[PDB]
Structures are given as structure tokens and as C-alpha cells.
Ligand binder design. Structure first.
Ligand code: HEM
Ligand code: HEM
Ligand code: HEM
Ligand code: HEM
Lengths: 146, 141, 141, 146
């Protein structure tokens, strides 16, 4: 996590405009749609057969909001992601058995979601800041795997 | 493999790119240079400064090639043969870098086509770029 | 694309494995589990302890499939249809993991077939495991 | 590193039995053969048209010894690979233009060469400790890229 002061202000300024509820549902739904293998964790979510069925699924929306919720908090402790994400890292490993590669896929989807939403405001340099952040978070979420 | 729907999706999204392909190609490059600095090792001879004409120049060539693969979506291996040869034999770009550019291309399109960049289209465009990458890397060994 | 030399190299090397493929399958899993512990996420229902019958049994299964692949080196897509299906629609193992098992398999053969693990044979086996990986992940999306 | 005293001792002890001369030439040569695209940096070496020409090329064998040497010395600063490879990291970026992915390809080749050489001795647990070192080395070397 080599976030220069200016990379950090940039992450923070944009994050101010985000509707985490909405972004969370979009990012998770889009993950399940672009990389359908990731659907392996949600067979209790019901119908994920088509894009509309995934995107509109009340369960996907609710889980996305949760995920992005934890992510936003992560954004207030950029200094200590590993600490911030420790119990969550354990849970994904030990209880949910989620391959950490899943965390990188979602980060990329999230980056595309932010670009989708902010248009021209998501400049090359802002993307570069967010690239470091999603990677920092995936790394923190994978730190307790064994 | 690309399904009829995928093909339709791609021709549609790319259709909208139209005349901006060149510029979006340049932009995808700059995004890549900034986010994945390791990709820069392949362009030691380029001026990578913002608004670099070399980058502009190169962005257009990449865009033309993508545009050519869309025009020949049913015969990509043949449409891209020459480019597959160049990459395998001269440039020898490590395969992992294709994924990085692909990614930066998806970000660029998303940032420019809000109405078209739907989940369905996003999925189609991602499979397409993966297929182009596969072709370009097919003759490596 | 496997050259004829490659197909030759592969069949010879695998030829030497013989009655030990099962043990080599089990050993490759064990090495995978220890070196890349994230791979363990896919086997929560297994006893991943050393000498576990679940691991031993699975090792045989994998080894056998490889056998079958070498045998139909000319028609992999077809020889492994069912397996491609299973992985794409049931197991849904992330594609990155295939590279990890492939590597632990090389390491295992190298440690067991010194004379036979020449540089050219090493190159062929790698390409081979790569092709097997491509086949197994071809129906993912 | 995140090596266990036991892991450290395993690494250290096997290395003591290594002929860097031979392992260095073989590791670099295998690289050029398995992943032909890495030859892009060694055109001046000559004829690398065949396994045979690669494996026999003295320039390859000699660069291979130089590489494993530096590697070998890094094994003595296992608790600060970053600082040991700082200048080498700059060199690789700024002078050689070597994509860090190459560091990972070699690392894996290295492990296959060790297994090749040590058979029995190169046990799962020993490979595991080596995998952590090669990853560690690759990361240190890539650390100064910008
Ligand atoms: C930025 C990355 C992520 C964060 C911050 C995050 C956060 C969370 C949180 C806060 C929970 C609920 C904790 C609890 O139940 O006590 C959770 C559960 C879970 N997460 Fe993650 N998550 C992330 C990524 C993912 C991804 C990418 C996947 C799968 C592809 C995933 C799979 C799961 C599953 C399967 C559960 C359990 C859901 C249930 O049945 O209640 N997570 N995650
Ligand atoms: C789908 C992805 C790609 C496409 C469509 C593409 C297409 C092209 C084209 C059309 C050219 C120009 C050849 C000519 O002179 O006519 C080119 C050159 C080149 N490409 Fe690729 N390429 C792709 C991926 C990559 C990647 C990922 C890299 C490295 C990060 C790369 C590195 C290069 C280099 C170094 C050159 C030579 C440029 C020069 O010296 O002018 N390419 N590519
Ligand atoms: C070289 C490529 C691979 C081959 C040839 C292969 C082959 C097989 C075979 C033959 C089976 C058993 C089918 C049956 O039970 O009838 C299987 C199942 C399975 N494979 Fe794959 N596999 C490969 C790669 C992987 C990888 C890399 C992983 C995960 C890291 C994996 C995860 C699984 C799992 C979890 C099962 C089911 C285990 C059980 O519940 O018994 N496979 N595979
Ligand atoms: C274990 C990882 C590696 C280590 C420790 C390492 C170390 C070295 C050292 C000590 C030098 C000597 C140059 C000097 O001091 O002037 C060197 C040069 C060089 N290395 Fe690396 N290297 C590694 C990986 C690689 C890889 C994988 C490649 C490409 C496939 C590579 C390409 C080069 C090149 C092209 C040179 C230039 C030597 C010259 O001046 O002719 N290195 N490396």
C-alpha cells in the first residue's frame, strides 16, 4: 500500500460521492454475471440463471451492500488494512472457504463499476489509486489463510 | 467461445465506439501505464508522457486491430494471424500483460459508454478481449 | 499447440510413470496443499492430513485422467468432455489454480524421473499440462 | 521473510549442498527453453534455436551463474530481501527493462531444477519453504519498479 498523500485524497474524495448500497449490488451482481464460476458460493440465493435474475435478486443486492459496507470501513483505516480485515480474513478462510482470487476479481469489477458511474471523473491517475486500494484490500482479506 | 449473443453484444458496443476507437485505445494505454507500471518495460523507446504522440499513434494501431477482429468475429485466428506472429516472434510480450490491457480497455469503454456498458455487454466484451488475447499468444511456444 | 515432438516426449515420460501415476497424483496434491494453501479452499470435506486416503484416492483419480489425456493427446477436448463439464458447472474451480497443480506435477515428475526430465521433456510436459488446463476450463463461460 | 525457524533451516540446509555453477546454468537455460519468449533479452548470446544450443551456450551458463550467485547471497539477508535487492531492482527496471513476471517464471524453474537434482530430499515441506523464498525474491526484485 504505497498510497501517496495525493493518491489517498483522491480515493477519499471520490468515495464521498458513492452510494454504497447501489455500488455494492452492482459490483457483486456484475461479478456473478462476468465470472459465473463465482456463483458457487451462492446456491441459496436462488435464481442466478440470467443477468436480470442476478442483478435484481434481492439476496445479491443485500449481500453486495454488506460487502461494500465492510469495504467502506476499510477505506477509513487505509493505514491498517490487515488489522481492519483480520476477523473477516479468518471467516472467509475457515468458514466460508472462499478462494482469495475472488477478492481480486471483485476489485476489478468494482473498478469498472466506478468508471461506469463517474465517467470522465475516473481519470487514469484516480484508477491507479483505486487499483492499489483494491489490491491492498484483497491482500488484507487473504492474510489469515492457511 | 463467443455465442451469437456475445457477437451481437460486441458488434453493438464496438459499433458505438465508431470514430473514437483511436482515442479510447490511447486512453486504455495510459491507464495501463499508470496502474501497471511494469507494462512500461515493453516501451523503453516511447515517450510515455501525457499526450505523447507515440502513445496516440500506438493507441490507434491497437484500436484498428480490435476493429478488425470485430469485423471478422467468425474468423479471428486468421484475421489476426500476422499480429499473432509479431507478438510471438518479435515483441515476445509476456502473456500476463494481455489481461492488464484488456482490463484497462474495459475501464475505458465503461467510462465512455454508460448506456451500453450493461452487465450482459460487460461479460461479452470481457470474453471477446480474452479471445483476442488468446489468439495473439497462440504461437508463443 | 502440441507438436509431434511434444506428443512423443509426453507419451515417453508418462510411459515411465507407469504403476506409480497414482502415487505421483497423491504427491502432487500434497505439494500443492502445502505450497499454495489457498488451494485447500476447494477441499473442505477432505482430511488433508499426510497419507489421507481421501487425498490418496483423489490422486489416483487425477493421475488416471492424465493417462487418458496422454492416450487421446490427439483428441483431448473430446476425451475430457465430461471432466470439462464437471469443472465448469459443478466444481467451478478458479482457473488460476490449474497452473498451481500443473507446477506441483512437474516438480513431482522431476523428483522421480531424473534421467527423463530433460529440458525438452520439461518444455513438452508444461505445454501439455497447459493444454489440459485449457480444456478443463473451456466451458467456464 | 515470513519463514519459520524450521522453514529457514530447511532452506539453508539444502542450499549448502548446491553447486551454484551447475544449478545456475540449468535454471536459466531451462527458462529460455520452456518459456521461449524470455529469450528476448539474450539475443547477443547467440544461437538459442534449440534446447541443445541453449543448454550448451556458455554465455547462458555464465549469466546463470551470475544470477544464482546474487540469489545465493540474498539467502543471507532473508529478513530484508528488499534492502538486499534494492539496487538490483533499480537496475532491472531502469537499465534492463525486465518485466518482473520473468522473476516468477525463473523462481518456478529453479524449484523444478532443485527437485530434479535432489529427488527424495526435496520433500513437500521443503518445496513449500522454497516457494516462499522464490516469491520473496521476485517481490524484492520488483519492489523498485515505477
Ligand atoms: C472486498 C471484498 C469482501 C468483503 C469486504 C466482504 C465482506 C463480507 C462480510 C462483511 C460478510 C458477512 C460476515 C458474516 O457473515 O459474519 C461476508 C460474507 C461472505 N462473503 Fe465476503 N466479502 C468480500 C468478498 C467476497 C467475495 C468476492 C465473495 C465470493 C465470490 C465472498 C463470499 C462471501 C460469502 C459466501 C459469505 C457468507 C454469506 C452468507 O451466507 O451470509 N465475499 N463477506
Ligand atoms: C489485445 C491486445 C493487443 C493488441 C490488439 C495489440 C496490437 C498491436 C498492434 C496492432 C501493434 C503494432 C504493430 C505494427 O507495427 O503494425 C502492436 C505493437 C506492439 N505491441 Fe501489441 N497488442 C496487444 C497487446 C499488447 C500488450 C499487452 C503489450 C505489452 C504491454 C504489447 C506490446 C506491444 C509493443 C511493445 C509493440 C511495438 C510498438 C512499437 O514499437 O511501435 N501489445 N500491438
Ligand atoms: C490437471 C488438471 C486437473 C485434472 C485432470 C482434474 C481431474 C479431476 C478428476 C478426475 C476428478 C474426479 C471426478 C470424479 O470424482 O468422478 C476431479 C474432481 C475434483 N477436482 Fe479436478 N482436476 C484438475 C484440476 C483441479 C484443480 C487445480 C483443483 C482445485 C484446486 C481441482 C478441484 C477438484 C475437486 C474439488 C474435485 C472434487 C473432489 C471430491 O469431492 O472428490 N481440480 N478433478
Ligand atoms: C533470481 C532472480 C534474478 C537475479 C538475482 C538476477 C540478478 C542479476 C545480476 C546480479 C545481474 C548482473 C548485472 C550487473 O550487475 O551489471 C543481472 C543482469 C541481468 N539480468 Fe537479472 N537476475 C534475476 C532474474 C532475471 C531474469 C529472470 C531475467 C530475464 C529472463 C534477467 C535478465 C537480466 C539481464 C538481461 C541482465 C543484464 C546483464 C548484462 O549486463 O548483460 N534477470 N541479473
Amino acid at each position: 500500500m504505497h498510497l501517496t498523500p495525493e493518491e489517498k485524497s483522491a480515493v477519499t474524495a471520490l468515495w464521498g460521492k458513492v452510494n454504497v448500497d447501489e455500488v455494492g449490488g452492482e459490483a457483486l451482481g456484475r461479478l456473478l454475471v462476468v465470472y459465473p464460476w463465482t456463483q458457487r458460493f451462492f446456491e441459496s440465493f436462488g435464481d442466478l440463471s440470467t443477468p436480470d435474475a442476478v442483478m435484481g435478486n434481492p439476496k445479491v443486492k443485500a449481500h453486495g451492500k454488506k460487502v461494500l459496507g465492510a469495504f467502506s470501513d476499510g477505506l477509513a483505516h487505509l493505514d491498517n488494512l490487515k488489522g481492519t480485515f483480520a476477523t473477516l480474513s479468518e471467516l472467509h478462510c475457515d468458514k466460508a472457504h472462499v478462494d482469495p482470487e475472488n477478492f481480486r476479481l471483485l476489485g476489478n469489477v468494482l473498478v469498472c463499476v466506478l468508471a461506469h458511474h463517474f465517467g470522465k471523473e475516473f481519470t487514469p491517475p484516480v484508477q491507479a489509486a483505486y487499483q492499489k486500494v483494491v489490491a491492498g484490500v484483497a491482500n488484507a482479506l487473504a492474510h489469515k489463510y492457511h | 467461445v463467443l455465442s451469437p449473443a456475445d457477437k451481437t453484444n460486441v458488434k453493438a458496443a464496438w459499433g458505438k465506439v465508431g470514430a473514437h476507437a483511436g482515442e479510447y485505445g490511447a486512453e486504455a494505454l495510459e491507464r495501463m501505464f499508470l496502474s501497471f507500471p511494469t507494462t512500461k518495460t515493453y516501451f523503453p523507446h516511447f515517450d510515455l508522457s501525457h499526450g505523447s504522440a507515440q502513445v496516440k499513434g500506438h493507441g490507434k494501431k491497437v484500436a484498428d486491430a480490435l476493429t478488425n477482429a470485430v469485423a471478422h468475429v467468425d474468423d479471428m485466428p486468421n484475421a489476426l494471424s500476422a499480429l499473432s506472429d509479431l507478438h510471438a516472434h518479435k515483441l515476445r510480450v509476456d502473456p500476463v500483460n494481455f489481461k492488464l490491457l484488456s482490463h484497462c480497455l474495459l475501464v475505458t469503454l465503461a467510462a465512455h459508454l454508460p448506456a451500453e456498458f450493461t452487465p450482459a455487454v460487460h461479460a461479452s466484451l470481457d470474453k471477446f478481449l480474452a479471445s483476442v488475447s488468446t489468439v495473439l499468444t497462440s504461437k508463443y511456444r
